[PDB]
Design a protein around this ligand. Sequence first.
Ligand SMILES: CN[C@@H]1[C@@H](O)[C@@H](O[C@@H]2[C@@H](O)[C@H](O[C@H]3O[C@H]([C@@H](C)O)[C@@H](O)[C@H](O)[C@H]3N)[C@@H](N)C[C@H]2N)OC[C@]1(C)O
Lengths: 63, 172, 108, 386
Amino acid sequence: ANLRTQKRLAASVIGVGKRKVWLDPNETTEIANANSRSAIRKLYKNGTIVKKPETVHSRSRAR
Amino acid sequence: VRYAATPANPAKSASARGSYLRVSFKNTRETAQAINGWKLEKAQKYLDQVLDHQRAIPFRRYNSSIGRTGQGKEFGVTKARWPAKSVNFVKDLLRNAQANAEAKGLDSSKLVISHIQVNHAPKQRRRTYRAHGRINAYQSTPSHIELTLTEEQIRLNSRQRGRLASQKRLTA
Amino acid sequence: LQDVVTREYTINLHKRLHGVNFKKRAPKAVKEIKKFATLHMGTTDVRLDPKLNIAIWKRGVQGVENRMRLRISRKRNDEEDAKEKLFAYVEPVIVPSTKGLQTVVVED
Amino acid sequence: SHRKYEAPRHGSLGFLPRKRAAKQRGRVKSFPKDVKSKPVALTAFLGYKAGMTTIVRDLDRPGSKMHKREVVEAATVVDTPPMVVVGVVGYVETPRGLRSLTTVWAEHLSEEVRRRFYKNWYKSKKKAFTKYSGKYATDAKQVETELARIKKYASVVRVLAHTQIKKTPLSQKKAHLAEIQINGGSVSDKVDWAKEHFEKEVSVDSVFEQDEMIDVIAVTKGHGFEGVTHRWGTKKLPRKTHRGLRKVACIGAWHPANVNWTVARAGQNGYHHRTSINHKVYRVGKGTDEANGATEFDRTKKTINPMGGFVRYGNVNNDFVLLKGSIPGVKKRVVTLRKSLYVDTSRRAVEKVNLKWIDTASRFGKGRFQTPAEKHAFMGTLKKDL
RNA sequence: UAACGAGAUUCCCACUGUCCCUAUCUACUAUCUAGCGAAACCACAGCCAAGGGAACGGGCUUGGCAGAAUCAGCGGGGAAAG
RNA sequence: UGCUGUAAAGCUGGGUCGAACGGCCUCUAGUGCAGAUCUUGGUGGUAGUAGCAAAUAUUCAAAUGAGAACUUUGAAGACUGA
RNA sequence: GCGAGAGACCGAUAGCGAACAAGUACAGUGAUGGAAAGAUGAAAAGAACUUUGAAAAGAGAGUGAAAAAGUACGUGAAAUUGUUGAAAGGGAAGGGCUUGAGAUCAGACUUGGUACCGGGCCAG
Ligand SMILES: CN[C@@H]1[C@@H](O)[C@@H](O[C@@H]2[C@@H](O)[C@H](O[C@H]3O[C@H]([C@@H](C)O)[C@@H](O)[C@H](O)[C@H]3N)[C@@H](N)C[C@H]2N)OC[C@]1(C)O
């Protein structure tokens, strides 16, 4: 119900900003149980946590 | 505890209290006077319609420089208002008093609000900051609320006697 | 009386957002569609599909389309003690053109 | 000390207070003075302001630079379907003023005039005048006696007439009911004339002829709360004035130690009752005529309406009055037309006007065509024409 | 006395709502609502005219008069406040 | 609730209350308040009034919860712009 | 300083600043400056239990000599405020004098004497 810690830990573990962390809306209870970085890594491996793609900055117009 | 007014027959009455309630004294006084002496069900429906902005609470004493509304025409006023927090507090107290009356075996449909009053509770102090490094008061004006629900020779002179005797003899 | 019914409407949002503050146009279109659904369905309980929210905000805060084609369904709100036995669910309808379309009862 | 320089007062003290009018229907404060030898005739009529247009005319004023030359003039169109007479009122002279003795109504009243007696018509049982109509059924002797009362005692007789607002494009269904004084003949003649016109229609042409100078009573356009600068036309304070400049700088001297009634103040502007006089009648048009906008010099078969309709009014499809210039009120406003209160023999009052041409281009923009036919001729075929 | 100057001043060109003479538009207020909620100030108070009077009265004398409760504004007076 | 005294004041009926107090003859004083922009504390009118308007901007749905404009998640729309 | 005994002294805004976790809390860079605040009850017996409510609480109940003593606690004034009852009200209110009206209070049938004697009050 409050996944603030989980968002922060996922950002640290995955190596991206908090803005690029996706916590599964439909798996709230399991994510709320993930208190350690190890549980976060397990969720990341199984796709419950996902690294969002970068916002594209194409250089085609520049070239 | 001592209530300000005591019912004539306590077996047909139920009471409720709230003390040190952080709700405006002035708005609460207006809302308490709006339903004083009403049937309980009539008052509850009216308070629900107040929370809907379908009817308003008439503001009779604490109303200086408040707005005007056409929903005051029901009560013959132009200044009326919809104080939601006071209405919610009064509804909670009416519900508690109704529960007490039910526990005493009383009939809800016959209940009338026979007594209700609002008193000042002790103020709660906060601070506000003014220009030129000054400190002013920023206080609350809390309420004490109580309410009660109730089921709904001639002696004559000698000359006067003589006059009456003469008159009675004259008419048979 | 058919309580459960689905119809497709066209709302003229251009004339409803006339003169509106530019940073309130998309938020007011949300309120306008809710008032539109209550006018046609008779329910103050109006629910907007998140895809409708995406369509409203597609072109930013003041980029609302002149006309939107909407599917509105009146459905039973059993959910006892809810102040409304019915409710309206509003979702977008993808069409090639938003002109010339009339109110149509949708069969399911 | 005295004002350093002299200037006239801003605004007129004779139109005070500048408050909202009590009713939206402008009331006739005074009627024309009664002349007994004249034929029995109405003195006023109620219509609806529809809009403005343009005319072209030859001027007939010898000695003017524009004598026998064309002038372009603004005109106002008043939608005036016929009124229905539904009652009569008798007035008696008293040392305290005129007092109405009694009122007699017609047997049948239309729904539009009976809608005038209701604030919530759809929730009502429509009982208005339902027991009064029984006063006719038996033998109408009560009605005859009331009319005999009016003949015996009244010195002023006015008729009760209402508009047929359902003939206008207005979405309002309530008819406007007004008293129009009856002038000419004796009181008995007046009561007879009113009785014979019960439930009947009377048209504008039976009241106002063409070239007549008439008065208009209406309520002006509302503006809400206005500051002194526009309400009274006072001078704006300099640009660098602290706390603003759309103000009157001095609202009075130290003594009298009170703000005087003659000082300009912010307050409600417009929506006032006005009686404007001397508006010449350029045309009394007929609703049946399909060449209302046509003239002897411009023979296009044309109605008075402009292309697209009068903006925010609709189309004038009844009798109408074309008036020189502008009159108080707005589009849709009920306006009262009254005969002149004096006899005027100036050249402008007695001039016969002959309209060359009436503009019927669109009022919704820079309209450049007078007719759909002219537009089609100028533009040729279009894609939508096929 | 060349050069320099957020220094004082006059004229000129350009410019323009500074003005003739004002109009219209936008955002935020004001406004109305829910919640929250101060301060200055306060003998008692609060409609005018004249008189007399510490010689410019809300009160006193003589007149004019005088009808609940009020909202938005306003800057005449309270010889308003500081 | 009444009574006495010109008065300062004194006595008494009723209610509240819980541990000391008074009359008379004298003694003694840090002995009587409306004021001192008095002191300290408390409380009003003002007044539900002024106001809570800088820094572009929020929205839909789900979860939680007695309760969600403001918490969390998802989806968007934005901004800081090295 | 240490140990004692006293008073025509003060009695919680008094008496030392401090009767209390007082030179404390707090302020100032610093030297320094420096408060407020005593009392349920004999005894916590400090309200078990039931019920309404999300809860705070309320209503029953209970303890107590007293809850008109409920750890917002001895008594509990005034300013100021709510409710109830009575009354009054055309640009202030209040006051004196006087009477009316409405309310309240009071007295001689006496500490009365043996049906009478005799007395009190208001009046002709
Ligand atoms: C509960 N609040 C605490 C409390 O301990 C409070 O106590 C007072 C207490 O002193 C009062 O009691 C008082 O009794 C007398 C008399 C005037 O009442 C006073 O003279 C005396 O100073 C004082 N003890 C008492 N009546 C109410 C409590 N709240 O005193 C301090 C405080 C922080 O406010």
